[PDB]
Structures are given as C-alpha cells and as structure tokens.
Amino acid sequence: MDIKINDITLGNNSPFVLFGGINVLESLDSTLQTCAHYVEVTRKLGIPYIFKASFDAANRSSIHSYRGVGLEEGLKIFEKVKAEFGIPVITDVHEPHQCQPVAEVCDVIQLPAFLARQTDLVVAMAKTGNVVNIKKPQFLSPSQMKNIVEKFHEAGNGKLILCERGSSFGYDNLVVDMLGFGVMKQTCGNLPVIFDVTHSLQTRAQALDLALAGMATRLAGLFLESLHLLEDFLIRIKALDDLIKSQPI
Amino acid sequence: MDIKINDITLGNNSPFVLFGGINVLESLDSTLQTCAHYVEVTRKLGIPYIFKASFDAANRSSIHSYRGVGLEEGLKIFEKVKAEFGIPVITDVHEPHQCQPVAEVCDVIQLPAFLARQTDLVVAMAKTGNVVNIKKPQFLSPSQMKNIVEKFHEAGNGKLILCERGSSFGYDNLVVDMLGFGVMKQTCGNLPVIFDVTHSLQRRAQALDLALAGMATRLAGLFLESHLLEDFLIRIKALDDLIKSQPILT
Amino acid sequence: MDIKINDITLGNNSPFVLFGGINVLESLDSTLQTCAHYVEVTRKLGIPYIFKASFDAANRSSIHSYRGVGLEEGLKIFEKVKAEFGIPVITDVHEPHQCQPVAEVCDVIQLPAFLARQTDLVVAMAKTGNVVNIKKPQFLSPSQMKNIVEKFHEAGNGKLILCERGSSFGYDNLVVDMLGFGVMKQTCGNLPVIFDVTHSLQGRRAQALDLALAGMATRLAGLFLESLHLLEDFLIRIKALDDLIKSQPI
Amino acid sequence: MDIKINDITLGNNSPFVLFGGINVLESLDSTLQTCAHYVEVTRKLGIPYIFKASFDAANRSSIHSYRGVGLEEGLKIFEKVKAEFGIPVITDVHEPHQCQPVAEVCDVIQLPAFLARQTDLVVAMAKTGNVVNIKKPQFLSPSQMKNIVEKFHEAGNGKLILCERGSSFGYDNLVVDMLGFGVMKQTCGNLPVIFDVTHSLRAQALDLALAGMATRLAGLFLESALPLHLLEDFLIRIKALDDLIKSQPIL
Ligand SMILES: [Cl-]
Ligand SMILES: [Cl-]
Ligand SMILES: [Cl-]
Ligand code: NA
C-alpha cells in the first residue's frame, strides 16, 4: 500500500523518501537554516523530502534541561517552514489534547516509541485522519507491530508508516534485525516501512553501513537527524535505492 | 533506606509487603469484594498489604475495552477502601495534572514503565511529596535506574520504590536478571526494591519459582498483577522470613 | 530421578550437593590442599561434596599458556584425591578417545558446554556408562536440552545431570533465567539439575551469593562454586535455604 | 588485506567470492552434479567460486544420522572436483590430526564455530600454512574475533578469513548485526570477511544477503538452504549490488 503525502508518493516499491531535521526546535531562524540546507541537497539529488522536528523535549535528561519552544511557538515555526519551502512536515505528540491542533498544521504526526501502547493517544491520533508515523519500540517484535496497526484500523485510520529504530540487545545496546522489515511488510499489509538509522546507532562509517544494509531490503524511506557530509551520504543511499527498486520483487 | 507507609515499614531488610488488587476499578461493590479477599488472606498470615488498582486503563489491548471509572470516581472508591480496611493503597498516574488530586487519597503513586522517562510527569509526581513506585522498563538496565532516581531527587522527593519487571530477551520473551536487584540497591542508595513477578510471566508453578528466586535476594516486597493465594503466600513468607532473619553477610 | 554417586544421592528433592575444586590441575600438593579445604568446610556443615578439576586446558587463552598436567598425570592426581579423601570426583573430556580412560578413574565426566552438540563425544561418553554432567550451552534454550538427553538415551546412558551456566544476553554478557530450571525438569524427566554459579558470572561475592540463593530457591540437586572464611559463610546460607525449600511439598 | 586462493583474489574491496555447495559429502556422482551446476551459473555471471562440503558432519540432529563419507573418501571426492572443474575447495576440520591430510588437498580449511576456542586445533591449523576460514560462534561478539586471530598469528599463520553466522538473540533465534562486519574489519586488520547467510537464518535469504553485502564484504557463503535451480536468479541480484558497492570508493 502506497500513501500520498501531498506531492510525495511514499511506499515500499517507490523511490525512497528522506525524513530529516533537528532533534528539538530552538528558534525560527535556526530551523529555517537547517531546513533550507536539506531542501537544496534533496532537490538536486531528486529525493523527496519531509522536514522533521520536535517542539517539545519530553525526555530531557535533567529537570533543568531545555524544554523546546513549546506547542504554540512550534506550530508557528512549522507554518513558516511549509510556506517558505512547500514541503510536508512531521512532528511528534505526547498527549491526546495536542493531537488535533498539531494535525491541523503538520502533515505527518508521530507516535513516540515510548508511548506506542498508550491507547488514548493512539485514538486521538487516529481521529485526526492524518498520516501517522508509528515508531517501533526497541522492546516490541516486528510481529507485535500488527497489534498497534489493528488499533489504528479499528479507530478508522489506515494511513500508517512503520518506523524501525533497533531492538534491545542485552543492556544498553541495540541491534537492527534486517529480517524484521520483511516481517512487518508481511503481517501489516505492506504498509510503508521506514528506517530510523540515527536512533538505531545511539548506543560516520557506521551510519552509512547500517543505512545501506537496511535500504538494501527495499524500503519506503530513511529517517535521520543532524564539510559536505549529508550530500555525499545521500548520493550513496540513492545509488543503492535506485538499483534495488529497479529489480523486480 | 526504609519508607513509612502509614503503619507499614517498607525496606529491603523488613518483612516483605504484598502489593496487589484488581487491574481496573469499575464499581465500589466489585472493588470492596476483591480487596476483602486479599485483606483476609494477608491478615491471617500477618503479611503487610497495600491494595492496588488503576482508575484509568491506559494500555488496554483494545481501544474499546473499558477505560476505568476515571479519576474522580476512582478516588472515591480508594477513599472507601481506606476507610473500610484501614490499609494503604497505590495507583498509577498518567498526566502531571492528575498527580496532586490522586496523591491526596493514594498513599503510593506509581510511574508507569512507559512514562518512566517523561520528565514533566516525574517532576509533578515528585512535587506531591508522596511515596512513589517507579516501574522499571524492560529495556532499561538496572544501572540506568539511577538516572530516574536522580530526577526525583532534583525535584525534591526521595521516597522512592524501584519495581523490577523483567528485561527484553530476544523477541517477546522476558528474563528476570536476579543480579539486577543488587545493582539497583548498590547504585540507588538502597531504596526499597520490589518485584512485579506477574508482568515477567507475560502457570502457578512458574510464578512460584520466579517469586521465590527474586525474594531470595532480599527485597522489600512482592508485586502482583494477579486457597490458591494463601498457599502461594505461605511459601513466599517462609523464604522471606528465613532470609530476613539472617544478617547481611560480613 | 535420583543418581547414586558412590554414597551420595543426587536429585532435585535431595539435599544439595556441592561441586567445586580448581580450574586446571597444576601439582599434586596444591590440589590436595584445595581439596582438603572444601572437605573440611563441607564436613563441618554436613554437605555432600564432589571435587572437580580439569587435567586439561583446552581453551587456554594463549598458545603459550599453561597446558595443565595432562591426562596421564591428571588421572594420577584424581587417584590420590580419591584415596586420601574418599570422595567422588568430576572432570571434563574434550575428545572421544579420552572418555574410557578418564571414566576408569573419574566418577562423573562432564560434557563441556561448547561441545554439547558434538555427536561423537556424546556417544563416546555415553558408552562409558559413567555418570555424565551435561553443561547447557549459553546459546541453547532450556527446551532444547531434551534433544541432548534423547541422544544419550539412544547411545545407552541415562545417568545424566543437567548443568545451568547462564544464557547469552547481548554481547559479552550472561543472564540466568530462573524459569529454565523448571523447563528442564519438566521436559527431561526430572533428571538432576545443578547450577554452575561460577561460570554464570562474568560487593562482588555479594553477587555469587545472591545468584546461588535465587537458583537454589527453585529446588535444585546441586551447585558449582569456587573458593576470612567466605566459602563457609556462603554455604551456611545456601544450606539453610536449601533445607527450607526441600522440606516443602512440591 | 587480500588473500590469493589460486587465481582468485579474496578481499573486502574485491568482487565477492561465492563459497557454495552442500552440507555433507554423500556420494561421488551427486557431488559432481551439484558442483557442475554451481560452476555453470558462476561462470555464466563471471563470479569467482569455491566449492564447499563437509566429509564429517559433526553436529547431526541424531547420533546415527550419516556422518558423511569420512576423511579418506572425502579427500578423494575433493580431488575429483578439483580435477574436473579446476576450482578451489573448502572443508572443515575437527581434530588436529586431520589438519595435514585435509590441507594437502583442500585450498581452504575451516574452523567450526563450536571448536573456535580449541587452542590445540587452532595451532595445528595454523601450522598447515593453509588459508583458514574462521567461523564466528553465535555467542561471540565481533570484537572478540581478534583473540582468535591473535592465536593464529602467534602460531605463524596470517591467511585468515572471518565468517559471520549471526548472534544469539534470546532463545532459539539469531540476529545478524550489520555493524559487526565493520567492527571485525577495524579490529582484525581488514582481513577478508564473508557472510554465511544460510546458517544465519527464501525471500529471507535474499534480503539478508543483500543487506550484508551492502556493507562491502569479500564473500558470501551458502549451502543449497537455497533451492539449486533458483541459484542464478539469486546470484544476479547479489552480483548487481556487489558490483554497485565495490565500484564506489570507500568512506
Ligand atoms: Cl524504544
Ligand atoms: Cl557456552
Ligand atoms: Cl555457534
Ligand atoms: Na503532599
């Protein structure tokens, strides 16, 4: 199943889409400058591009840590991003009440990994009718993903992306099971599967090897965070994706 | 470090405390009935007991499964449980705004595993001044519990219980690392550590083996998401009494 | 199923048997000293005891590392240990040809964990008719032990002990699944199950005590352990727990 | 570091080498037939090829299951393969005494994973001077491969291949850590790394093989286990990705 995001076709047998941008929104001008760069690079490489950021640092590690710009100022920055660039955007939500007004602005809304089993947030996300990105928790198997998709379907929204970020492997370590992408396609009705290579690594030659290996299994998209390093990175990812997508299934 | 919960002393060198009750509150009548059974068994054996229930069923497996009575009517039920049995109670909270009103009635407030890194919730829980049960995520290592404890301490609350639930072990399976109890005591100032045996089991023989193994390491309490109860508790009490009666090694 | 090893009765509902000694035999005199210590402590505590050592260093870390005294001198030392102390002994074998000569002298022969699926070694060990200790590989699940047991039975030997040594847990780490003991008992005919606490690991001997107590709480036939009187202090506590567990009806 | 195996160059920056054949040697005519098919297909696509089989199946799922033709007859069969097709061959050794007899006939000798820490066997394999494939145990981390490599070096043999076969992942189940390849390259001096996709496990073998080879590897290790007739379709896709990845500079 493909999904249309404005102009963009996202699917497991389509050219890969890049989801990319900043950990946490800090200021308008800082964001425009990051986004500008991703757009120029993707535009000449001809890679469809969706801008990502959080407006809220929900898991900030110290009670004195930066909070983010908050919802109100974050949606303003997102509104500026879409008007200046004409691209879709994606952000995460952590509370049912945030869902409707986030979804008014942001093309894709994201269910945070920690919160995948929070049923009221699932329902409030489903209700908006928007494309939803479901971040697979490190503690859930690719087979348990259908249970979450079932909830979204029962609540009447089938426009779902599944997003891989690694699996718990002993203490304090992650491994990405390259067979899990296939399992998710097979049990979840060939919904778009994308690969969050950045969070898979947190526990760069390493990021390139991992991104290539995951994209070799034929995926809808790549999901990251951030002289000319991105561009050279994406040239290599595009070369692989083009080849893979050109072979019959 | 011991924690006083009304007339109960909770600590890794005190007689173990049983936490248990019902999954989700629906009615007063139904709650009082379950709680009465726990009370009668634990009283007969002399085991301290804290009644546990959710007012919001936040991770129900179907979206349309009953969501619980909700905050307002839930707290009314908890009030009547406390009045009728004279025991402490515990419930989980989900948003910052819930913490104060819940803490007015519930002696222990519980931080759900999936919220354990939500800084706003941790702060609002800390500010109640109540005893807090921290449920350990199955993907978090025992040494990472320190970081959560730290956040609570920064926000002014040291009355913390750590609740073991098992660890991710390949796909689907959980294993309980019996060494992780000691790592938590050692790294987290010997806060009371309790063992949620049920979650780890996703059969009576299995629950018994696992509960006995954990209690053998010397723990403040046993946490169920559960004369069947009585027979099980007779065995746990036997082990706990033996272990606790002996001094920690020289 | 219980096993007689000379005068010792090994079984999951019998008093636990301690297995211990040294890693690699170095000389007759230091062997006899180490054994005397274990014998002194276990006799005074009333615990049956089987001495263990390797005559071999098959996995020695450097090609220049110490080899051990080897089979011929190894077997001589085991003869002397047995004549001096009148206790059974246990050693590992890594090659099929080693099995019959080693079994001449050693009461129990041990299938190293790395080799537990090596069909020729299984067969050669089985043919000796001796008591065999099967080390569960860290990479095998408890439900797979039935397959190795089945092979030993096809090769004609049912005097089998199963030995837990932990399971792979990410890179460079082991966890012991306390539910595995019960799975082995249930699927392998209640053969004696023993717990290699020493290999399951890797303040600190705090750790070995915690692990040993947690494992013995599940009701096991025996324990593998290595040594002012730490061994004594550990065993007093393990024996108290074992006596309680074994006095409860299953 | 590259290794020459007769006229084949094996290396992490060279066209991938296929190590393929069967599990256990069973009979002469069947072996030759299966080898013929591998040879035909790899020759057709220009893929360097090394025939693999065991003469001693040491971990059979039942004790009286056929162990294989044994050393003497197994080496005769390998001789016939090399004579008929003119390709290199690879087999596993199980005891020190086997190492010399096997190495005089076989181009690559393999250290089974379950024996990987047996020092006596490592020493005797090292002393042949033969190219050695080291099979990484599923319970061993990538950074611990350097300890095995060091024992081989100490005994005088540096012609070593590292073979990935997956890592234990909970019970009864394997995951391949795609970052494990780079760790082995970095810590073991960029010795050739190959990927045993068969023992790491359909559509799956292909996904897994393509992911592995995307990280830039010296070879692919499989048993036909694949259906033998779909071999060409499988290899066309591997070769396409390998040719892409190898054609770009590193970094
Ligand atoms: Cl996660
Ligand atoms: Cl092992
Ligand atoms: Cl292995
Ligand atoms: Na208060």
From Swiss-Prot, chain A:
Protein name as catalogued: 2-dehydro-3-deoxyphosphooctonate aldolase
Gene name of the encoded protein: kdsA
Localization in the cell: Cytoplasm
Gene3D superfamilies the UniProt entry points to: Aldolase class I (3.20.20.70)
Species the sequence originates in: Neisseria meningitidis serogroup B (strain ATCC BAA-335 / MC58)
Stretch forming the signal peptide: none
PANTHER family, sorted: PHOSPHO-2-DEHYDRO-3-DEOXYHEPTONATE ALDOLASE
Entry keyword annotation includes Transferase: yes
Enzyme Commission numbers on file: 2.5.1.55
Family: Belongs to the KdsA family.
Swiss-Prot record, chain D:
Enzyme class per UniProt: transferase
Disulfide bonds: none
GO molecular function, one term: 3-deoxy-8-phosphooctulonate synthase activity
The keyword Heme appears for this protein: no
GO biological process: keto-3-deoxy-D-manno-octulosonic acid biosynthetic process
Enzyme Commission numbers on file: 2.5.1.55
Protein name: 2-dehydro-3-deoxyphosphooctonate aldolase
Organism expressing this protein natively: Neisseria meningitidis serogroup B (strain ATCC BAA-335 / MC58)
Gene: kdsA
